[PDB]
Ligand binder design. Structure first.
Ligand SMILES: CO[C@@H]1[C@H](O)[C@H](n2cnc3c(=O)nc(N)[nH]c32)O[C@H]1COP(=O)(O)OP(=O)(O)OP(=O)(O)O
Ligand SMILES: [Mg+2]
Ligand SMILES: [Zn+2]
Ligand SMILES: [Zn+2]
Ligand SMILES: [Zn+2]
Ligand SMILES: [Zn+2]
Ligand SMILES: [Zn+2]
Ligand SMILES: [Zn+2]
Lengths: 49, 93, 67, 479, 44, 82, 115, 45, 87, 8, 576, 98, 257
C-alpha cells in the first residue's frame, strides 16, 4: 500500500461505472449527472483545463 | 473652458511642467500628509521625518485624516454669535 | 416537477388533464389534436400542457427516505 | 455552381455545433447582436431550475429549485443533447412588449400578480449548515447539547427553545432570523465553565427546517448537517431574463384585472419595455415570440436552430395568419383600468423567461450603530457581519466637490470611528491619561500640567502609532 | 430523540453521547424525525 | 479688520447659507429663543428658514481673507442668495 | 420580508375613514374626495356617472400611487349645485343601473333555460 | 454592573453588541463586543 | 476630560530620539523575554505586557484604566545590543 | 460591427 | 510589515482614513417608480426601521416624541433608543421602566426614519458630483429602493439588477447642508458642460413626441384625467382648440399647462427639413417642427430629445435658468405623470412588423449589395494586374484596403438609407429613433438592411489561418464576404461565417469596455489628487493649500459654470 | 495527502512550496443549473494574467472556429481569458509515437 | 343626469361558459363589471393547511399551494358563509369555514396518484368540483401524506385562488368605428367573431357621434360557481360596494355640516 488516489466520478475506476440508470437511482445518484468531478473532502471539485 | 483652464494652470503654475503623476505632484512643496495620501505614502513620510518637515494643516486631505473640519466650503468661515441681536427681538421661548 | 393546477395566465384548471393528454398521445393523436380534444383553446392554456416536463416520475424512482 | 472551389476535402456536420453548451440554448442566435449572445451565456448559468434529480438526497449550500420548470416552446435541436428538456430552467411566459404604466421602464419588468399567485416563477431555497463536534482540544470538548443560560456562563439572548435534547432543531420547525439552529458547548478550562458555541441562523432566512442529519465525518467526529427550506415567491426586486440577453428586475406586480387584456381574455404574464429591443438589437426575442405563438397554437415545439434557411420570419408569419392572429404577432389590447382599447396594437406572444438567482431579499442590507472591527475600531464589512457600506475615496471627492464639509466630516469621522486622545502641549507625542484617577502625565517631559485633549479618528491614532513604531515622530502640536 | 436511518429506514432511539449507528443495519447516516408540533401553512 | 474697507461679496454664499441655517436650527432644537414668531412651525429647520427670511438670525459670519485678516459680516448685512 | 399583507388592499385598518371630503380652495364649488382602500373599479364608475351629469363641470379620479390603496376624486359643479350632491346622485344612479341590469340578466337566464 | 441596580445580571445583545440591564434597559458598555477577537502541537514558539 | 479640547494646527515630523524612546516607553529594561505568557497569561518584560496595553477585552492595563477603549496603548523599547541600520 | 469608421 | 500595512490600498493611509466603512448606511436593489417626484426616493420599511435619526426633545415636539417612545421599536413609526442628558442610552426594546419612558427637554429620542427625512443617495462608481444627490424619503411597502426615472441619467443607473447606497445624515447641521447644497432639484444643471444633467427619458420622451403631434386630439374626459395628474394645475380647464362640432383639446394645449410660468424658447425637432427656414412656410411649418414656446405656451412644434433632453437651451434648461429649481422639479414630475397616463390610452410596442420592410426595398438593398460586390471584384482584379496606383503616403496593400473599405461602406450606408426610407410613420423603431429615447439610425439600418463590415483592430477580419480567414474560404481571398462583410440583416439572419465574424467584432467591443473602465479610473483619481485643495478664496482668487495663486479670478472672469449660456456676439462676423 | 491537498486548495504543487503553485485549477462545481454544471465541466482557462489589460490574448481568433464557443465568455475582467469548448470538440487523450 | 337603462341578451349558456351582450351602457360600467368578475366575486377555497405527515417528494408548502389552487364547489353556501374576520368565534368554526381532511398512503407497488377525490369535506355542499380529478401529488410505495385543511370565503383581490373565472372576454366596437385602435394596415387584421362587416371592407366608416356601447362578454368558470352565478354575484357585489360608499359618504357629509 503506497497511498490513495482520488477517483473522478463515473470514470472507469469509479463505482458508478457501467451501471444502469435504475442502479444509479438505487445508490441515490442521478442518472443524468455528467460525472467528471472529484469529491474531495465532501465537495465536488472540477479541474479546469 | 474653466475646468480645462484650471488643469492647465495647475500643471504650468510653478514654471516647470508638472505632470499629474507621483513625481510631479509629490515634488511640489505641499504638506507631507497630503503627499502621503497620493501614491508614495510611507517614503514621503520617512523623508519628511528626516528633514523635520511640518504639515501646515491647511489642506483638505490633511484635515480629513485628522478628523477636523475641512477648509473646504462650509468650513472656510467661522460663525460667531451676535449678542446684541440675541437681546433684540421677541424671545418667545 | 408536477403538472400545475390552474394555468398561470387565465386560471383554467389544467391539472386534471395531464394524464389524459399523455393517454391521447399514446392513442397516436397529434399534440395539437390532443390539446383540442382536452378543451384547451387559448394558447396560454396549451402552453401549460405542451411545455410541461414531468420530473416527479424521475423523483419517484428514488427509494423513499422512510419506508 | 459558378466555380468557387472544386477541391473540397472535408465538410461540416452542422454549423450550429460551433456554439457551446450555454450558447446552444439561445433560440435564433444568428438574429441577435453578438454581445447579447455573450450576455445570455452568462445569465443562463445563473438561472433557476431543477439542477439535478437527486436534489432531495443532496445537502448543498445555496440550492435553488423552481416549482414548475417548463421546456422551451421554441427550442434548438442541439438542446436535446444538453438534456435541457429533461431538466429545464425557466417557464414559458406570455410576454407583451409594451409601455403600460412606466414601471417597466429601463430594463424593469411588470409581472402579473395573479399568475405569481398561481405558481408562476416560484422557487425554493435550501441552505445547509454544517457543524462538527470537535474533541481534539486538550481540555476543550465541543459537545452537542442544549445550552442553558443558568448553567452556561457564556450564553446569548436569542431563542434557544427550538433546540431539542441533542442540541439540534427538529425538522419541520420554523426558524426566523437570529435563532439557534445548532447548540454546541465548549467546556471551559478552569484556570481560576462555559463559553457559548451555538450556531445562529443567517438574518432574515425565515425558513422551515427540511432535513437534519447526524453522521461521523472523515475525522470521525460527530458531524451534523441541517437544511433549511425557504419558499421564494417573486417580488418587485427579483431579476428575470430571457434567452436573448434581456435582463431586468420586476418593476411592479399588477393583478389580472389591472393587466391589459386581449379580446380572448389573455393577459400578459410579463410586460417588458419596448425601449429594450432597438438599441440592443435582439431580434431573436421577437422571432421567438412569433414562433412561440405559432407553436402554442399548432401544438408542435418550434425549431430555432441557428442556421436553418428553411425557417424565415415570413413563413412563421403566414403560419400564424392561418391560426387567426395578426401575421406579425401584434394583438389589439384593452386597458385593464379603463377598458378602452389601446390605440397602438401590442406585440404579445409566449416567450421562455428565466429566473436568475439574484433576489432582493438576499441583497438588502441596512446598518446603524453595529459592531466594529478590532484593529481599526471601524464598522465591520459584509452583509453577514452587519457591515456598513464603504465611503470610498471617490465618494469623499464628490463630497468635496459639493462643499459639504460637515457631512464629509460626519461620514468619515463621527459615523465610523470617533475617538479621543490626550496630547502633551510641550511635545506633540501622546501622553498617558487616567480619566478615573484624574491624573494626566507625559513621559519624557516629566510634565503633567501641559496636556490637551484631541479628537481624532481611531484609524488616525493607529497611523500615528505605526509611524512611531517606525521611529517617525508625528508630533501633533495644537499651537 | 428518535433518528430515522438512511439505509434501512428504521427508527432508533439514541441517548445523548451515544454512538450514531443504526441497529439492524449499522449505517452511520441518521435523520431526525419530523417534529410533533404542527406548523400552519397558508395555501397562499 | 475695520468695519470699513470690506472687500468680500455682499451676497451670502451658498455654503454660508447652509451652515448658518443648520447651526441656527441646531440652536433652536436646543431650546434657544426664537426671534421670529412661529405660525405653528415645530421643525427647527423650518423655523430657521423663517428667521433667515426675516433676517433675524443672531449669527455674524467671519470671513477669512487669504492674507490672514477677517471680515465680520452679520447675517442681516449679507444679501440672501435667494 | 417587507411585503404587505394581501388583506391590506381592501380592509380599512382601525381609525381609517372610507371617505374624506376636503374642499378645493383654488376653484369655486369644487371638492376633492379621498376614498381609502379602493381601486380603479369604483373610481371609474363614479367618474363616468359624474361626467354624464350636465351640472358637473369637472370630474376625474386619480390613484396617487399603485402600491398604496387610495382614490382621489375631484368634482366641480356649477353654482346652484354641490359637489357632494353630485357624488351622492352619481352613486344612486349607478345603483339603479346595476339593479336594472341584475333584473334583466335574471330574466335572460330564465328565458335561455327551458326556452 | 448597572449603577442603579446592585447585583443585576446584564443581558447580552447581538444587534449593537452591548450588555443591557433587563429591568430598566440601560446600556452598560456602548460598543463593547467589537468582533470580540495549534496550541496542542509543541508549545509556545 | 479636564484637559481642554484642541484641534491640531500643525503636525511636526521628526526622527524619534533614542533617549526620548527610552523615557517614553512604559516598559523598563526592555523586552527581556521572547515568550508572551508568564504566570499563565501575563509576561512582565515580555511581548504581551499588561502595562503596554489592555488585554482580553475586560482587563485594565497597568498604566491607565483603559477598559479596552480609553487606553490608546503605550509604547515599549528594545535596547539592541549592537546598532542596526534603519531600512 | 458596422464599419471601419464606426464601431466594431 | 508596518510599511506594507500603510503603503498599499486598503491600508491605514487610504483604506482606513481617506475612505472607511460607515454607520447609518443601507443598500438594496433599485427599481423604477414614475409616481415619485424627482427628489423623493422610496425606502423599504425594514431599512427605514433599522436606521434611526436622533431628535432632540424640545417643548414643541415633546408630545410627538413621547408617542414615538410609547410605540417602541416594534411598531414602525417608533423609537429605538432614548438618550438622556447624562449620555445614558435607554434601549426601548429591552423593557424600560415606565419612569424611563418619560421625556424632558434635552433628551434625544432616536426615532425611526420617517417620510420627508433627507438622505444622500449614491451609486458606485461616483464619477461626478451628480452621483451623490440628496433625496427626500418616502416609505413604500416593498424591499427595493425606488427612484424616479429622470434621476437615472445622472446616476448612470438602469433597473437591471443595479444597486445604490443610502446614507442618512444624523445631525440637523449636516441635514441642512444636504438640503441646501446637494438636493436633486438644486443640481439639475451641471457646471461641467453648463447643460442640464437630467432630462425626460424613455417612455415619457417617446410619448411626448406623439403627444405633441398636430394629429393628437383629446376629448373632454381624457383631458379631465390628464389634468388630474398635473400637480400645478390652476383648476381652470383650458378652452378647447376645436369648440365645434365636438369639443376637442390638443396635446400641445395640455402640455402648455405643464410648462412652468412664462418661458420663451425656440428649438427645432430632429426631423426638421433644412430647406424649410429659407423657403416659405418657415413660420407655418408644414411638418410641425420648429418648437416655439411663447409666454409659457406651446404655440407649435413637436417635442423630442432636443427640446426636453439634456442639452443647452432645452426647455428644462431654460426653466431652471429662468423659473428656478423648485418649479423645474415640478416641471419634470408633471411631464412624466401626465404623459405616462396618456400613454395608457395610446400605448407603445416593438414587434417584427417594424423590422420588416417592403419587397421593393429588399430588392433595392440586394441590388446595392450585388453591385458593391462587383465593384470590390473589379478593384481586386485591378490590384492583381498591378494596374492599381499607390496612394501617396500609403502602401499598395493599404490603398487597396482603403478603396475596398470605401466601396463597402458606401454600399452599407446606401442600403441603410433605403431601409430608413421604407419606414412608415407608424413604425415604432422610427418613433424611438426620432424621439431620441433609444436607438439610432444605424441600429435601424442593421436591423432591416445590412449589419455591415466587421472590423477588428481597425482592419477587416484578419487572416487567422494561413492566408485565409476561415477554413471554408479559399487562400488569398480579399473579397467582401471572406474578410467580414455581413450582407444579411439581423432580421434575415447571419450565415454561419458571418456569425463568427460578428462574434469577433462584438468581442472587440466587450474588451474595449473592460479596459476603458480601469484606465479611466486611474486617470480620474490622479486628476482629483492633483487639484483637490484648489478653491475660490474670499479674495475670489483661486488658490491652493499653500496659498499660491493659481488664478487671479476663477475662469479668468470670476463666474460659475452653471449660470453661463451659449450666445452669439453678432458684432464679429458682419462686414463693415 | 499531496493529491488531496492540491485538489482541495486549488494550488498546483506542494503544500510547503507555493512559489511555483498555479492557482485557479480545481474549482468547486457550480450546481445552480444543469447548464452551469455542464459548462463548468467543459471549460478552458487561459493562463494569461487578469491584471494585465493587453487585449491580444482576449480577442476571438479565427482558429477558434468549431473548437471553442465564440459567444460564451465571462464579461468583466476575464473577457476572452476563460473559454468553453464547443459541442463537438474533443481534446486528444494522447498516444505513443512508436 | 340619470343612469342609462341597460339590456342583456344571453347568446350562449353552458355549464362552463356564459356569453352575453350588455347594451345601452357606459364603457366604465362594463369594464368595472368585468373587473368585479375577476376580483370581487366571493368563493370558498382552502387557505389553512396543517400537514401531519408528508413523505412525498414535493415539500409541504408545495402541497399546501396546490391544495389552495384546487377549486371547491361554492354555488350556494358562499352567500351563507361569513368571512373569518366577521365570525365571532376564535379561528375557524363551521359557520366561517369548511374542514377538508386528506389521508393517503401508498402500500401497493404501483404509484398512487393522490387526487382531489381523496379530499374529504365535512360539509356536503363544498366538494372539490367532483360529482378526471386534479392530481395533488404522486406517491411511491412507503410514502404517506396526511393533512387537515380549512377553507375560507374570499375574493380574487386577496389571492388568485379565489378567482371565479378562467377567462373573461371583453370586446366593444368589433368593427373599428370609433377608431379607438388605429390599425396601421387595416386589411391584415383578422375580423372579429362579432364583426358584422362584409369580407371586402376591413373597417367600418368612422362615426364621430358614436360612443362605446353594446359590449360583448364571454365568462368562463372554473367550476367553483355556476357561470351565470358569477355574473349575478358580481353585479350584486358592485351594488353593495356602491351602497357602502353611499352610507359612509352620508356620514361624512352630515358630520362636516
Ligand atoms: C453603463 O456603464 C456602466 C457603468 O460604467 C458600470 N460598471 C459596470 N461594470 C463595471 C466594472 O467592471 N467596473 C467599473 N468601474 N464600472 C462598471 O457599469 C457600466 C456598463 O456595463 P454593461 O455594458 O454590461 O451595461 P448594459 O449595456 O450591458 O445593460 P442591460 O441591457 O443588461 O440592462
Ligand atoms: Mg444596469
Ligand atoms: Zn390559460
Ligand atoms: Zn510631553
Ligand atoms: Zn438502519
Ligand atoms: Zn438597570
Ligand atoms: Zn493604557
Ligand atoms: Zn367561526
Amino acid at each position: 500500500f503506497i497511498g490513495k488516489i482520488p477517483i473522478m466520478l463515473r470514470s472507469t475506476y469509479c463505482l458508478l461505472n457501467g451501471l444502469t440508470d435504475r442502479d444509479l437511482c438505487e445508490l441515490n445518484e442521478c442518472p443524468l449527472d455528467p460525472g467528471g468531478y472529484f469529491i474531495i473532502n465532501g465537495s465536488e471539485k472540477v479541474l479546469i483545463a | 473652458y474653466r475646468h480645462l483652464a484650471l488643469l492647465c494652470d495647475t500643471m504650468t503654475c510653478r514654471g516647470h511642467l508638472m505632470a499629474i503623476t507621483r513625481h510631479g505632484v509629490n515634488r511640489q512643496d505641499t504638506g507631507p500628509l497630503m503627499k502621503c495620501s497620493f501614491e508614495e505614502t510611507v517614503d514621503v513620510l520617512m523623508e519628511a521625518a528626516a528633514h523635520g518637515e511640518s504639515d501646515p494643516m491647511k489642506g483638505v486631505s490633511e484635515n480629513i485624516m485628522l478628523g477636523q473640519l475641512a477648509p473646504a466650503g462650509t468650513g472656510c468661515f467661522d460663525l460667531l454669535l451676535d449678542a446684541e441681536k440675541c437681546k433684540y427681538g421677541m424671545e418667545i421661548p | 416537477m408536477i403538472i400545475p393546477v390552474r394555468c398561470f395566465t387565465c386560471g383554467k384548471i389544467v391539472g386534471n388533464k395531464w394524464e389524459a393528454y399523455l393517454g391521447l398521445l399514446q392513442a397516436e393523436y397529434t399534440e395539437g389534436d390532443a390539446l383540442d380534444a382536452l378543451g384547451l383553446k387559448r394558447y396560454c392554456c396549451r402552453r401549460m400542457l405542451l411545455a410541461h416536463v414531468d420530473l416527479i416520475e424521475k423523483l419517484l424512482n428514488y427509494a423513499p427516505l422512510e419506508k | 455552381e459558378v466555380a468557387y472551389c472544386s477541391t473540397y476535402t472535408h465538410c461540416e456536420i452542422h454549423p450550429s455545433m460551433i456554439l457551446g453548451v450555454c450558447a446552444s440554448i439561445i433560440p435564433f442566435p444568428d438574429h441577435n447582436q453578438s454581445p447579447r449572445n455573450t450576455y445570455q451565456s452568462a445569465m443562463g448559468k445563473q438561472a433557476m431550475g431543477v439542477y439535478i434529480t437527486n436534489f432531495h438526497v443532496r445537502m448543498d449550500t445555496l440550492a435553488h429549485v423552481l416549482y414548475y420548470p417548463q421546456k422551451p416552446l421554441v427550442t434548438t435541436r442541439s438542446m436535446e443533447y444538453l438534456r435541457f428538456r429533461e431538466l429545464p430552467a425557466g417557464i414559458n411566459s406570455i410576454v407583451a412588449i409594451a409601455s403600460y404604466t412606466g414601471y417597466n421602464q429601463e430594463d424593469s419588468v411588470i409581472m402579473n400578480r395573479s399568475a405569481v399567485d398561481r405558481g408562476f416563477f416560484r422557487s425554493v431555497f435550501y441552505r445547509s449548515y454544517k457543524e462538527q463536534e470537535s474533541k481534539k482540544g486538550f481540555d476543550q470538548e465541543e459537545v452537542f447539547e442544549k445550552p442553558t443560560r443558568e448553567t452556561c456562563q457564556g450564553m446569548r439572548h436569542a431563542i434557544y427553545d427550538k433546540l431539542d435534547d441533542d442540541g439540534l432543531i427538529a425538522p419541520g420547525v420554523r426558524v426566523s432570523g437570529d435563532d439557534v439552529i445548532i447548540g454546541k458547548t465548549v467546556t471551559l478550562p478552569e484556570n481560576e465553565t462555559k463559553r457559548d458555541c451555538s450556531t445562529f441562523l443567517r438574518t432574515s432566512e425565515t425558513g422551515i427546517v427540511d432535513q437534519v442529519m447526524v453522521t461521523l465525518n472523515q475525522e470521525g467526529y460527530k458531524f451534523c448537517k441541517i437544511r433549511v427550506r425557504s419558499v421564494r415567491i417573486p417580488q418587485i426586486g427579483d431579476k428575470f431574463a430571457s434567452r436573448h440577453g434581456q435582463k431586468g428586475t420586476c418593476g411592479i406586480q399588477y393583478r389580472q384585472e389591472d393587466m391589459p387584456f386581449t379580446c380572448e381574455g389573455i393577459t400578459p404574464d410579463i410586460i417588458i419595455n419596448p425601449h429594450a429591443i432597438p438599441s440592443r438589437m435582439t431580434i431573436g426575442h421577437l422571432i421567438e415570440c412569433l414562433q412561440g405563438k405559432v407553436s402554442a397554437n399548432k401544438g408542435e415545439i418550434g425549431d430555432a436552430t441557428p442556421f436553418n434557411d428553411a425557417v424565415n420570419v415570413q413563413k412563421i408569419s403566414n403560419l400564424l395568419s392561418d391560426y387567426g392572429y395578426h401575421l406579425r404577432g401584434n394583438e389589439v389590447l384593452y386597458n385593464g383600468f379603463t377598458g378602452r382599447k389601446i390605440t397602438s396594437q401590442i406585440f404579445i406572444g409566449p416567450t421562455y423567461y428565466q429566473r436568475l438567482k439574484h433576489m432582493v431579499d438576499d441583497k438588502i442590507h441596512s446598518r446603524a450603530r453595529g459592531p466594529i472591527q478590532i484593529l481599526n475600531r471601524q464598522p465591520m464589512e459584509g452583509r453577514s457581519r452587519d457591515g456598513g457600506l464603504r465611503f470610498g475615496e471617490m465618494e469623499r471627492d464628490c463630497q468635496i466637490a459639493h462643499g459639504a464639509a460637515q457631512f464629509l466630516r460626519e461620514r468619515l469621522f463621527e459615523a465610523s470611528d470617533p475617538y479621543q486622545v490626550h496630547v502633551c502641549n510641550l511635545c506633540g507625542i501622546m501622553a498617558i491619561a487616567n480619566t478615573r484617577t484624574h491624573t494626566y502625565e507625559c513621559r519624557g517631559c516629566r510634565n503633567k500640567t501641559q496636556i490637551s485633549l484631541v479628537r481624532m479618528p481611531y484609524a488616525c491614532k493607529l497611523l500615528f502609532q505605526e509611524l512611531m513604531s517606525m521611529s517617525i515622530a508625528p508630533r501633533m502640536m495644537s499651537v | 430523540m428518535i433518528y430515522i436511518c438512511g439505509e434501512c429506514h428504521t427508527e432508533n432511539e439514541i441517548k445523548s453521547r451515544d454512538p450514531i449507528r443504526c441497529r439492524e443495519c449499522g449505517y452511520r447516516i441518521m435523520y431526525k424525525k419530523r417534529t410533533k408540533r404542527l406548523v400552519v401553512f397558508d395555501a397562499r | 479688520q475695520a468695519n470699513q474697507k470690506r472687500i468680500t461679496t455682499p451676497y451670502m454664499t451658498k455654503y454660508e447659507r447652509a451652515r448658518v441655517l443648520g447651526t441656527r436650527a441646531l440652536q433652536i432644537a436646543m431650546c434657544a429663543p426664537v426671534m421670529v414668531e412661529l405660525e405653528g412651525e415645530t421643525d427647527p429647520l423650518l423655523i430657521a428658514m423663517k428667521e433667515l427670511k426675516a433676517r433675524k438670525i443672531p449669527i455674524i459670519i467671519r470671513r477669512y481673507l487669504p492674507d490672514g485678516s477677517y471680515e465680520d459680516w452679520g447675517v442681516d448685512e449679507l444679501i440672501i442668495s435667494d | 420580508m417587507n411585503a404587505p399583507p394581501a388583506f391590506e388592499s381592501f380592509l380599512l385598518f382601525e381609525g381609517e375613514k372610507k371617505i374624506t371630503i376636503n374642499k378645493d380652495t383654488k376653484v369655486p364649488n369644487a371638492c376633492l374626495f379621498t376614498i381609502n382602500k379602493e381601486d380603479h373599479t369604483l373610481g371609474n364608475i363614479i367618474k363616468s356617472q359624474l361626467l354624464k351629469d350636465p351640472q358637473v363641470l369637472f370630474a376625474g379620479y386619480k390613484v396617487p400611487h399603485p402600491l398604496e390603496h387610495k382614490i382621489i376624486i375631484r368634482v366641480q359643479t356649477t353654482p346652484d349645485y354641490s359637489p357632494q350632491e353630485a357624488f351622492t346622485n352619481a352613486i344612486t344612479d349607478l345603483i339603479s343601473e346595476l339593479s336594472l341590469l341584475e333584473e334583466r340578466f335574471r330574466v335572460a337566464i330564465k328565458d335561455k333555460q327551458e326556452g | 454592573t448597572c449603577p442603579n441596580h446592585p447585583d443585576a445580571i446584564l443581558v447580552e445583545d447581538y444587534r449593537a453588541g452591548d450588555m443591557i440591564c433587563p429591568e430598566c434597559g440601560l446600556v452598560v458598555g456602548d460598543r463593547v463586543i467589537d468582533v470580540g477577537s495549534n496550541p496542542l502541537l509543541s508549545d509556545g514558539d | 476630560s479636564a484637559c481642554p479640547l484642541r484641534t491640531i494646527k500643525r503636525v511636526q515630523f521628526g526622527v524619534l530620539s533614542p533617549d526620548e524612546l527610552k523615557r517614553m516607553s512604559v516598559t523598563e529594561g526592555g523586552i527581556k523575554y521572547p515568550e508572551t505568557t508568564e504566570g499563565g497569561r501575563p509576561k512582565l518584560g515580555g511581548l504581551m505586557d499588561p502595562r503596554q496595553g489592555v488585554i482580553e477585552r475586560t482587563g485594565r492595563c497597568q498604566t491607565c484604566a483603559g477598559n479596552m477603549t480609553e487606553c490608546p496603548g503605550h509604547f515599549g523599547h528594545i535596547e539592541l545590543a549592537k546598532p542596526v541600520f534603519h531600512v | 460591427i458596422w464599419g471601419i469608421g464606426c464601431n466594431p | 510589515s508596518l510599511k506594507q500595512r500603510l503603503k498599499g490600498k486598503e491600508g491605514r493611509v487610504r483604506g482606513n482614513l481617506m475612505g472607511k466603512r460607515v454607520d447609518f448606511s443601507a443598500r438594496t436593489v433599485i427599481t423604477p417608480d414614475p409616481n415619485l417626484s424627482i427628489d423623493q426616493v422610496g425606502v423599504p420599511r425594514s431599512i427605514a426601521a433599522n436606521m434611526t435619526f436622533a431628535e432632540i426633545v424640545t417643548p414643541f415636539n415633546i408630545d410627538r416624541l413621547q408617542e414615538l417612545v410609547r410605540r417602541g421599536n416594534s411598531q414602525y413609526p417608533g423609537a429605538k433608543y432614548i438618550i438622556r442628558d447624562n449620555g445614558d442610552r435607554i434601549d426601548l426594546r429591552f423593557h424600560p421602566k415606565p419612569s424611563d419612558l418619560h421625556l424632558q427637554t434635552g433628551y434625544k429620542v432616536e426615532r425611526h426614519m420617517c417620510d420627508g427625512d433627507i438622505v444622500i443617495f449614491n451609486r458606485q462608481p461616483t464619477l461626478h458630483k451628480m452621483s451623490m444627490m440628496g433625496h427626500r424619503v418616502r416609505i413604500l411597502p416593498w424591499s427595493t429602493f425606488r427612484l424616479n426615472l429622470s434621476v437615472t441619467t445622472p446616476y448612470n443607473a438602469d433597473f437591471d439588477g443595479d444597486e445604490m447606497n443610502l446614507h442618512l445624515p444624523q445631525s440637523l447641521e449636516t441635514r441642512a447642508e444636504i438640503q441646501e447644497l446637494a438636493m436633486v432639484p438644486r443640481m439639475i444643471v451641471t457646471p461641467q458642460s453648463n447643460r442640464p444633467v437630467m432630462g425626460i427619458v424613455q417612455d415619457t420622451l417617446t410619448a411626448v413626441r406623439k403627444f405633441t403631434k398636430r394629429d393628437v386630439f383629446l376629448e373632454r374626459g381624457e383631458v379631465m384625467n390628464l389634468l388630474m395628474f398635473l400637480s400645478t394645475w390652476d383648476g381652470k380647464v383650458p378652452q378647447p382648440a376645436i369648440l365645434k362640432p365636438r369639443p376637442l383639446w390638443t396635446g400641445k394645449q395640455i402640455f402648455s399647462l405643464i410648462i412652468p410660468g412664462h418661458i420663451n424658447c425656440i428649438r427645432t425637432h430632429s426631423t426638421h427639413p433644412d430647406d424649410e427656414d429659407s423657403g416659405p412656410y418657415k413660420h407655418i411649418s408644414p411638418g410641425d417642427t420648429k418648437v416655439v414656446v411663447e409666454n409659457g405656451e406651446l404655440i407649435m412644434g413637436i417635442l423630442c430629445k432636443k427640446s426636453l433632453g439634456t442639452s443647452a437651451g432645452s426647455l428644462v434648461h431654460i426653466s431652471y435658468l429662468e423659473m428656478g429649481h423648485d418649479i423645474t422639479r415640478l416641471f419634470y414630475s408633471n411631464i412624466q405623470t401626465v404623459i405616462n397616463n396618456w400613454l395608457l390610452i395610446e400605448g407603445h410596442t416593438i414587434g417584427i412588423g417594424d423590422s420588416i420592410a417592403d419587397s421593393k426595398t429588399y430588392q433595392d438593398i440586394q441590388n446595392t449589395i450585388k453591385k458593391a460586390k462587383q465593384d470590390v471584384i473589379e478593384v481586386i482584379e485591378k490590384a492583381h494586374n498591378n494596374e492599381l496606383e499607390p496612394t501617396p503616403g500609403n502602401t499598395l496593400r493599404q490603398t487597396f484596403e482603403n478603396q475596398v473599405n470605401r466601396i463597402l461602406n458606401d454600399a452599407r450606408d446606401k442600403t441603410g438609407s433605403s431601409a430608413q426610407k421604407s419606414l412608415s410613420e407608424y413604425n415604432n423603431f422610427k418613433s424611438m429613433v426620432v424621439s431620441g429615447a433609444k436607438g439610432s439610425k444605424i441600429n435601424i439600418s442593421q436591423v432591416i438592411a445590412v449589419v455591415g463590415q466587421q472590423n477588428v483592430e481597425g482592419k477587416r477580419i484578419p487572416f487567422g489561418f494561413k492566408h485565409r480567414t476561415l477554413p471554408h474560404f479559399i487562400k488569398d481571398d480579399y473579397g467582401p464576404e471572406s474578410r467580414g462583410f455581413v450582407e444579411n440583416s439581423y432580421l434575415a439572419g447571419l450565415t454561419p461565417t458571418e456569425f463568427f465574424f460578428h462574434a469577433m467584432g462584438g468581442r472587440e467591443g466587450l474588451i474595449d469596455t473592460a479596459v476603458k473602465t480601469a484606465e479611466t479610473g486611474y486617470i480620474q483619481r490622479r486628476l482629483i489628487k492633483s487639484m483637490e485643495s484648489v478653491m475660490v478664496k474670499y479674495d475670489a482668487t483661486v488658490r491652493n493649500s499653500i496659498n499660491q495663486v493659481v488664478q487671479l479670478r476663477y475662469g479668468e472672469d470670476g463666474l460659475a459654470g452653471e449660470s453661463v449660456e451659449f450666445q452669439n456676439l453678432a458684432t464679429l462676423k458682419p462686414s463693415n | 495527502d499531496g493529491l488531496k491537498y492540491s485538489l482541495a486548495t486549488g494550488n498546483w504543487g506542494d503544500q510547503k512550496k507555493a512559489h511555483q503553485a498555479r492557482a485557479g485549477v480545481s474549482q468547486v462545481l457550480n450546481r445552480l443549473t444543469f447548464a452551469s454544471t455542464l459548462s463548468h465541466l467543459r471549460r478552458l482557462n487561459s493562463p494569461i494574467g487578469r491584471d494585465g489589460k493587453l487585449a491580444k490574448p482576449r480577442q476571438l481568433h479565427n482558429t477558434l472556429w468549431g473548437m471553442v464557443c465564440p459567444a460564451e465568455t465571462p464579461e468583466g475582467h476575464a473577457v476572452g481569458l476563460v473559454k468553453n469548448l464547443a459541442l463537438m470538440a474533443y481534446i486528444s487523450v494522447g498516444s505513443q509515437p512508436s | 343626469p340619470y343612469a342609462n337603462q341597460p339590456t342583456v341578451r344571453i347568446t350562449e349558456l353552458t355549464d362552463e361558459n356564459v356569453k352575453f351582450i350588455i347594451e345601452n351602457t357606459d364603457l366604465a360600467v362594463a369594464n368595472s363589471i368585468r373587473r368585479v368578475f375577476i376580483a370581487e366575486v366571493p368563493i370558498i377555497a382552502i387557505d389553512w393547511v396543517q400537514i401531519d405527515a408528508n413523505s412525498s417528494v414535493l415539500h409541504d408548502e408545495f402541497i399546501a399551494h396546490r391544495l389552495g389552487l384546487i377549486p371547491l364547489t361554492s354555488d350556494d353556501i358562499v352567500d351563507k358563509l361569513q368571512y373569518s374576520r366577521d365570525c365571532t368565534c376564535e379561528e375557524f368554526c363551521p359557520e366561517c369555514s369548511v374542514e377538508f381532511t386528506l389521508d393517503v398512503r401508498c402500500n401497493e407497488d404501483q404509484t398512487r396518484h393522490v387526487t382531489s377525490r381523496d379530499l374529504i369535506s365535512n360539509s356536503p355542499r363544498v366538494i372539490p368540483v367532483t360529482s378526471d380529478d386534479i392530481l395533488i401529488v404522486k406517491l411511491r410505495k412507503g410514502q404517506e401524506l396526511r393533512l387537515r385543511a380549512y377553507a375560507k370565503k374570499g375574493f380574487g383581490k386577496e389571492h388568485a385562488k379565489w378567482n371565479p373565472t378562467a377567462g373573461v372576454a371583453f370586446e366593444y366596437d368589433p368593427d373599428n368605428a370609433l377608431r379607438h385602435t388605429v390599425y396601421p394596415k387595416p386589411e391584415e387584421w383578422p375580423k372579429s367573431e362579432y364583426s358584422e362587416l362584409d369580407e371586402d371592407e376591413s373597417q367600418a366608416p368612422y362615426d364621430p357621434n358614436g360612443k362605446p356601447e353594446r359590449f360583448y362578454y364571454n365568462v368562463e368558470s372554473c367550476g367553483s360557481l355556476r357561470p351565470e352565478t358569477i355574473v349575478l354575484s358580481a353585479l350584486s357585489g358592485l351594488k353593495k360596494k356602491l351602497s357602502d360608499l353611499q352610507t359612509q359618504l352620508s356620514h361624512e357629509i352630515q358630520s362636516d355640516v
